[PDB]
Design an enzyme around this catalytic site. Structure first.
Site, PDB file in Angstrom:
ATOM      1  N   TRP A  33       0.803  -1.207   0.000  1.00 26.61           N
ATOM      2  CA  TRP A  33       0.000   0.000   0.000  1.00 26.61           C
ATOM      3  C   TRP A  33       0.858   1.290   0.000  1.00 26.61           C
ATOM      4  O   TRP A  33       0.329   2.402   0.135  1.00 26.61           O
ATOM      5  CB  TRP A  33      -0.919  -0.024   1.217  1.00 26.61           C
ATOM      6  CG  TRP A  33      -2.092  -0.999   1.197  1.00 26.61           C
ATOM      7  CD1 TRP A  33      -3.403  -0.660   1.094  1.00 26.61           C
ATOM      8  CD2 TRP A  33      -2.067  -2.431   1.400  1.00 26.61           C
ATOM      9  NE1 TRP A  33      -4.197  -1.770   1.222  1.00 26.61           N
ATOM     10  CE2 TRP A  33      -3.410  -2.872   1.416  1.00 26.61           C
ATOM     11  CE3 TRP A  33      -1.046  -3.374   1.580  1.00 26.61           C
ATOM     12  CZ2 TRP A  33      -3.768  -4.213   1.606  1.00 26.61           C
ATOM     13  CZ3 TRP A  33      -1.395  -4.704   1.768  1.00 26.61           C
ATOM     14  CH2 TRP A  33      -2.755  -5.113   1.781  1.00 26.61           C
ATOM     15  N   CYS A  73      -6.643  -5.323  -1.328  1.00 30.44           N
ATOM     16  CA  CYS A  73      -7.839  -6.095  -1.028  1.00 30.44           C
ATOM     17  C   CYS A  73      -8.655  -6.589  -2.214  1.00 30.44           C
ATOM     18  O   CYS A  73      -8.807  -7.805  -2.373  1.00 30.44           O
ATOM     19  CB  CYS A  73      -8.695  -5.427   0.042  1.00 30.44           C
ATOM     20  SG  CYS A  73      -9.650  -4.083  -0.509  1.00 30.44           S
ATOM     21  N   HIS A  91     -13.819  -2.021   1.885  1.00 31.67           N
ATOM     22  CA  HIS A  91     -12.994  -3.234   1.916  1.00 31.67           C
ATOM     23  C   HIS A  91     -13.693  -4.380   1.164  1.00 31.67           C
ATOM     24  O   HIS A  91     -14.893  -4.598   1.324  1.00 31.67           O
ATOM     25  CB  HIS A  91     -12.671  -3.654   3.356  1.00 31.67           C
ATOM     26  CG  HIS A  91     -11.734  -4.819   3.435  1.00 31.67           C
ATOM     27  ND1 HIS A  91     -11.725  -5.699   4.495  1.00 31.67           N
ATOM     28  CD2 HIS A  91     -10.788  -5.262   2.569  1.00 31.67           C
ATOM     29  CE1 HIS A  91     -10.818  -6.635   4.279  1.00 31.67           C
ATOM     30  NE2 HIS A  91     -10.237  -6.395   3.115  1.00 31.67           N
ATOM     31  N   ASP A 117     -12.225 -13.847   3.857  1.00 33.87           N
ATOM     32  CA  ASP A 117     -11.440 -12.641   3.637  1.00 33.87           C
ATOM     33  C   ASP A 117      -9.940 -12.985   3.602  1.00 33.87           C
ATOM     34  O   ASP A 117      -9.333 -13.267   4.634  1.00 33.87           O
ATOM     35  CB  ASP A 117     -11.789 -11.672   4.779  1.00 33.87           C
ATOM     36  CG  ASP A 117     -11.105 -10.310   4.670  1.00 33.87           C
ATOM     37  OD1 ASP A 117     -10.376 -10.052   3.683  1.00 33.87           O
ATOM     38  OD2 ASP A 117     -11.310  -9.497   5.610  1.00 33.87           O
ATOM     39  N   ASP A 163     -18.432   0.326  16.728  1.00 36.16           N
ATOM     40  CA  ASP A 163     -19.011   1.644  16.958  1.00 36.16           C
ATOM     41  C   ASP A 163     -17.835   2.589  17.150  1.00 36.16           C
ATOM     42  O   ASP A 163     -16.789   2.170  17.654  1.00 36.16           O
ATOM     43  CB  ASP A 163     -19.852   1.674  18.233  1.00 36.16           C
ATOM     44  CG  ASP A 163     -21.179   0.978  18.082  1.00 36.16           C
ATOM     45  OD1 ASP A 163     -21.717   0.950  16.956  1.00 36.16           O
ATOM     46  OD2 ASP A 163     -21.697   0.468  19.101  1.00 36.16           O
ATOM     47  N   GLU A 189     -29.313  -1.327  12.880  1.00 30.28           N
ATOM     48  CA  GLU A 189     -28.858  -0.727  14.117  1.00 30.28           C
ATOM     49  C   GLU A 189     -30.070  -0.080  14.759  1.00 30.28           C
ATOM     50  O   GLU A 189     -30.782   0.680  14.106  1.00 30.28           O
ATOM     51  CB  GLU A 189     -27.799   0.340  13.838  1.00 30.28           C
ATOM     52  CG  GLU A 189     -26.491  -0.214  13.319  1.00 30.28           C
ATOM     53  CD  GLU A 189     -25.740  -1.060  14.352  1.00 30.28           C
ATOM     54  OE1 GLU A 189     -26.153  -1.085  15.535  1.00 30.28           O
ATOM     55  OE2 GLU A 189     -24.718  -1.693  13.982  1.00 30.28           O
ATOM     56  N   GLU A 232     -31.113  -7.109  16.588  1.00 36.55           N
ATOM     57  CA  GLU A 232     -29.778  -6.528  16.425  1.00 36.55           C
ATOM     58  C   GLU A 232     -29.088  -6.423  17.792  1.00 36.55           C
ATOM     59  O   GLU A 232     -27.940  -6.838  17.966  1.00 36.55           O
ATOM     60  CB  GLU A 232     -29.909  -5.148  15.771  1.00 36.55           C
ATOM     61  CG  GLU A 232     -28.765  -4.782  14.862  1.00 36.55           C
ATOM     62  CD  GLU A 232     -27.477  -4.558  15.616  1.00 36.55           C
ATOM     63  OE1 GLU A 232     -27.479  -3.734  16.557  1.00 36.55           O
ATOM     64  OE2 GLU A 232     -26.465  -5.210  15.276  1.00 36.55           O
ATOM     65  N   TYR A 258      -7.255   4.589   0.909  1.00 36.87           N
ATOM     66  CA  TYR A 258      -8.651   4.134   1.061  1.00 36.87           C
ATOM     67  C   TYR A 258      -8.842   3.398   2.373  1.00 36.87           C
ATOM     68  O   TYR A 258      -9.968   3.073   2.775  1.00 36.87           O
ATOM     69  CB  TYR A 258      -9.116   3.262  -0.113  1.00 36.87           C
ATOM     70  CG  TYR A 258      -8.499   1.884  -0.192  1.00 36.87           C
ATOM     71  CD1 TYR A 258      -7.219   1.704  -0.695  1.00 36.87           C
ATOM     72  CD2 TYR A 258      -9.200   0.765   0.241  1.00 36.87           C
ATOM     73  CE1 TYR A 258      -6.655   0.442  -0.760  1.00 36.87           C
ATOM     74  CE2 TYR A 258      -8.647  -0.497   0.177  1.00 36.87           C
ATOM     75  CZ  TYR A 258      -7.380  -0.652  -0.321  1.00 36.87           C
ATOM     76  OH  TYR A 258      -6.830  -1.905  -0.393  1.00 36.87           O
TER      77      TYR A 258
HETATM   78 YB    YB Z   1     -24.461  -2.172  16.133  1.00 36.14          YB
END
Ligand code: YB
Ligand code: YB
Ligand code: YB
Ligand code: YB
Ligand code: YB
Ligand code: YB
Ligand code: YB
Ligand code: YB
Lengths: 705, 702
Positions: free
Chosen positions: B261, B296, B355, B378, B420, B467, B472, B535
């Protein structure tokens, strides 16, 4: 900049940045003249932290527990005007946000698992602090700093190597994930630096002493090095799951990165034969000095070294031996033995083998990643095999999840379950090409799983922990649970029982194999029994069939019939393998009903031990003359015989070599040792030559002040 | 012997053992006829007619035809024979690497077997079937005759090597997909589109998967042989992806691609250059060393080739505002200063503008039921339990639900989409006070190509609930139970800011609004910190600071416009032209901290593709590529890359330099060997400007 990340990865404990002695932005606020960390072996800190044992000079301490320091100032500390805090930092790239830079503010009262330091005493220019680590703190060597706070920034001490503090895991602390309920265990699984390793085979369990030596000079430092050589992120060194998951993978030198090069070739080109090692110290240090993988090791040497590793950092750990181990199970709960049409065992189609014994480790810790109840011991096998990631160690696999076939939980569960709970299936490979399963032996694999006991050198049957009793709803259901969670069971599984008892012999003696058929029904049977005797490695891999014999039996109804075969020393002697083991295949064919009967046993020939006798003062600091004698039992000359001696706390591992020994000869090796540890110690000797090998010995000594 | 094992491991599809012809007597085969030829029932019915390969290719668990010709008519009286398929150097029927196909009257479901479907003047016509759990790879074929004095067998003949792959068409294969469109899209599609940019300005791009091109099937297996993968494991999608994804990112000279990168790229191709997987994989097989360099989306495209080529239905997913390197922490730390300032000294964690990671379809029999399906894989490493690796197959259903206790590496991916942001004031004396928590930033949108065309498909709902709602909250509270970490214990003046998107080199606005819903006034003191970033979020440098001062009368709505001028940034732009804007503020009365942040990318202009000629297979066609230097500067060492699967092989061309505002043209003649709607793809990478792409939607005929 960075592109990938703002700050490079903090993953070395050795690498260090220098912190500014002064950094203001926008002088008599207090200044330190000296810092006293009550280290000293005899002192408060180390003893109460159980670290008093390490052959090390810096202060060593265990997480989650309070320790003592005194800070000497240039003027009396005035709580109304002064301000400071102690700092601890690890690595080149500290970061509070990741527990790599730690503040420790002075506090009124210490709280539950939070860093803080209560001022406990004040003299003229001196403050005695009581500092508390957090029970989740990273483990490694931290750098200490004292920072006086000026309203314009900070003034802080300078690099001082004598104050580096080690924070190890804490089995004695109620909040440490690695916590142990009671002292007996803690003493044994953490504080003991010697263990016994069980080998041989079930009906002749043999033991030998192994030096973990986790408190010897350099070892604590090598363990941090191992984690560094593995580029282990410092932020994960406070997690026992990740420590064991990464430390174990480093044990086996894939190519040339790890600690040990595994070799079962019976030659061992440019290295030490796995059977010669007397303990962990040599290896680990020899690894440190070369930064290259040590040759050679086999499952027990990998398990020994890893056990030193775990205990040395403070994780409760023990070696375990499984009898008749299905290594390389690939999650298959079955082992295939192929028979020829005429009852014999098909030498070519049977390439799968059960290990006479196979050791692995068990580490105590909680399992916050799994549901409740799966904490406790975790099975960690550092002898690789194909799991999901493919050809690596396995575990930590929760021992409790194994016993219940709950193999959907990490790590590598089906492979340990299938190591300890899988059947042998006897199949006939017909001349045309078909295959039919004759019988299945559901009680041979995992017969006995054992470990050294808390008391002394005796064994402890831990089989009920890995599995229930074969033939009970329990063992049956666990088997079913594991089946839905991906344990493979490929093949879907005349009243004439027969069994054979081999009589355990000495190296060089003729012995007997006693087969016994017992025609149980009311018919006269005609059987054709077949005996196959193979010389083998302990892993079950054969080298040669040295005795083939076939014989007919006419059994009487309800009666019996015993057949005694006699094995003469000369039929095997010329081609035995290291651990002198032989395997027997006894298969019979009842030409009436076509039913087949097959049985197999393993036997390890016995060899007389090395003699170790002490001659001197059993007092710490005083001399004692250790004597090690070996007598060539064979009727041939042993050459380049390497005798070994060890015993953590009494001597450092030494090794002597004799150009040769004529047969039935004896040799003595006097050595003056200077016992530096007091109490129940133990010496350990081992032998290995170009011919005979895997010969041990030990003596228990009582050294006092 | 061997000490450790009886037989050395069988982990190379390339290694082969020579089988004996007479291991110890009538019936001798003169020839075998498979119905290879891409127009035949075999490749057509099996959906393997696209591979530029002349050997037979069949998807496991499905029947295919073959015909053996014997020296004399087969007689079921005194004749016994069977077809043998062997793989590797140490085959074992036991291990599935030796398959002896017996003649059966009828074919059972899930077992190997050949039904004699017809027999004539000395020729038997077979209909062979394979286990739907069959090892995927390139098998050797023999014909064994079982005489009273042993087996007679055909010799080594390469022309029969049969490839057997995964098969999502078969309802008994783990890989089965119950929809033909998805099978087409997820497996037959060799052209894909990768989404990037930023949540508000989604940019799209074209990627040549190229699974059917000359040499790719064979390179995919090569990858596995390189990973020393046990043959028996190749029939398991799970272990195929688990081991496969680990090969993509070269950990020191091992894997396929070397990640990088550093806007420099000292000795290889800038990741933004590649137009597809093709030349990378081929460069890999030829150099037998890792290809430089990748990122990525690049890793994601190469992997997506590896899965599709073998038959596992894969697809690339892009997450906007993705918390990478989370270490299972469900919180991102943004450090505020005492007055409301973003403290760049401490704030060293960055959230990725976007990503890209793969998704592979397969059942998960190693876990409960309800978790099979789409599995997030991933290959862009991060610290997971093992320590700095790809994050293995992780059930998206589990993620969505919080069951992070089910392998593989679930907590780490569940966290890329659920952290968060925590605005914390690092007081001047050492204290810390969390001021605010933004529970709406990370994983704002998760997108993937639509099945029909090159469109977008919002799959955010698959990875998470909304959310704020109950299911959730639960999943969160559940993941918290299995190891996900939540370290920090957590005036009606609404403030938000809009930034207009300008083109590369144009001045643009940025309005900041403040709504007061209180029946009183306030004194705000705002700050704006604009930075130039990769990015990934990592800032190169802050190019504009500005502290505001506001007074909000009650029930007021004041909007204030800032102006970013081209010159303020043009000097320091990074390859993707990302800009990061922060806006903190403190209501002086209450001392509350309001905080918002956004990103934008400079609209880099398209490359132009235009073609002239005979748009027919085998018929020459000319492709005209042209780029217009949009910079007021000289673009040194300019590479232009041409691609288009089925139309052209990847190509590149270098222009000494391009004068400001001038226009270069590259013309080349392609001979499309594939019909149907196709596509040409282009990119440009020069010593300064890069991440410029162009594509054309042609349609070959015949
Ligand atoms: Yb959350
Ligand atoms: Yb290597
Ligand atoms: Yb290397
Ligand atoms: Yb069993
Ligand atoms: Yb069982
Ligand atoms: Yb390497
Ligand atoms: Yb290497
Ligand atoms: Yb203003």
């Amino acid at each position: 900049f960075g592109g990938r990340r703002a700050v490079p990865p903090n993953n070395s404990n050795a690498a260090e940045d220098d912190l500014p002695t002064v950094e203001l932005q926008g002088q008599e606020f207090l200044n330190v003249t000296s810092v006293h960390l009550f280290k000293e072996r005899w002192d408060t800190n180390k003893v109460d932290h159980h670290t008093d044992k390490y052959e090390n000079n810096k202060l060593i301490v265990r997480r989650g527990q309070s320790f003592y320091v005194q800070i000497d100032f240039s003027r009396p500390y005035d709580p109304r005007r002064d301000l400071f805090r102690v700092e601890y930092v690890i690595g080149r790239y500290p970061q509070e946000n990741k527990g790599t830079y730690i503040p420790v503010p002075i506090v009124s009262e210490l709280q539950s698992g939070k860093w803080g330091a209560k001022i406990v005493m004040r003299e003229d220019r001196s403050v005695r602090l009581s500092i508390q680590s957090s029970p989740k703190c990273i483990v490694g060597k931290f750098r200490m700093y004292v920072a006086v706070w000026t309203p314009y920034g900070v003034l802080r001490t300078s690099r001082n190597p004598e104050t580096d503090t080690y924070i190890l895991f804490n089995p004695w602390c109620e909040d440490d994930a690695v916590y142990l309920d009671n002292e007996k265990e803690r003493e044994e699984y953490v504080l003991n630096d010697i263990g016994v390793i069980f080998y041989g085979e079930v009906n002749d369990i043999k033991t030998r002493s192994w030096s973990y030596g986790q408190f010897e000079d350099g070892i604590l430092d090598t363990c941090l090095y191992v984690m560094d050589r593995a580029q282990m992120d410092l932020s994960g060194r406070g997690n026992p799951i990740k420590v064991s998951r990464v430390g174990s993978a480093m044990v086996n030198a894939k190519d040339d990165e790890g600690v040990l090069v595994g070799s079962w070739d019976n030659i061992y080109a440019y290295g030490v034969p796995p059977s010669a090692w007397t303990g962990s110290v040599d290896i680990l240090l020899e690894y440190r000095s070369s930064e290259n993988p040590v040759r050679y090791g086999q499952c027990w040497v990998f398990a020994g070294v890893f056990n030193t590793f775990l205990r040395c950092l403070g994780i409760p750990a023990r070696i375990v031996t499984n009898y008749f181990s299905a290594h390389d199970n690939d999650a298959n709960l079955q082992m295939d033995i192929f028979l020829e049409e005429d009852g014999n065992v098909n030498s070519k189609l049977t390439k799968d083998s059960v290990w006479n014994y196979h050791c692995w480790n068990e580490a105590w810790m909680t399992r916050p990643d799994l549901p409740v109840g799966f904490g406790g011991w975790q099975a960690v096998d550092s002898t690789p095999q194909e799991n999901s990631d493919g050809m690596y160690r396995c575990g930590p696999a929760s021992v409790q999840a194994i016993k219940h076939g709950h193999v959907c939980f990490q790590f590598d569960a089906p492979f340990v379950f299938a190591e300890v709970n899988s059947d042998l299936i006897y199949i006939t490979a017909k001349k045309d090409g078909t295959h039919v399963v004759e019988n299945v032996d559901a009680t041979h694999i995992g017969k006995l799983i054992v470990t050294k006991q808390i008391g002394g050198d005796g064994m402890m049957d831990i089989t009920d922990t890995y599995k229930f009793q074969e033939g009970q709803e329990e063992e049956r259901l666990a088997l079913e649970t594991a089946l839905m969670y991906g344990a493979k069971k490929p093949l879907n599984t005349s009243n004439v029982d027969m069994d054979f008892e081999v009589e355990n012999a000495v190296l060089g003696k003729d012995f007997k194999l006693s087969i016994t058929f017992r025609n149980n029904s009311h018919n006269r049977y005609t059987i054709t029994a077949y005996l196959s005797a193979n010389i083998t490695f302990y892993t079950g891999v054969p080298k040669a069939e040295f005795k083939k014999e076939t014989f007919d039996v006419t059994l009487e109804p309800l009666s019996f019939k015993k057949e005694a075969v006699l094995i003469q020393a000369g039929e095997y002697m010329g081609q035995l393998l290291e651990q002198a083991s032989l395997h027997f295949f006894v298969t019979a064919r009842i030409n009436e009903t076509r039913d087949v009967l097959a049985k197999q046993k393993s036997t390890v020939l016995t060899i007389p031990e090395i003699i170790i006798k002490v001659r001197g003062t059993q007092v710490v600091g005083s001399d004692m003359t250790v004597t090690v004698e070996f007598t060539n039992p064979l009727k041939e000359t042993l050459r380049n015989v390497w005798v070994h001696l060890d015993g953590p706390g009494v001597t450092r591992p030494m090794k002597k070599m004799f150009r040769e020994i004529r047969p039935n000869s004896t040799v003595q090796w006097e050595e003056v040792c200077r016992p530096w540890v007091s109490g129940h110690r133990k010496l350990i000797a081992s032998m290995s030559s170009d011919s005979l090998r895997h010969v041990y010995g030990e003596l228990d000594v009582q050294i006092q002040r």
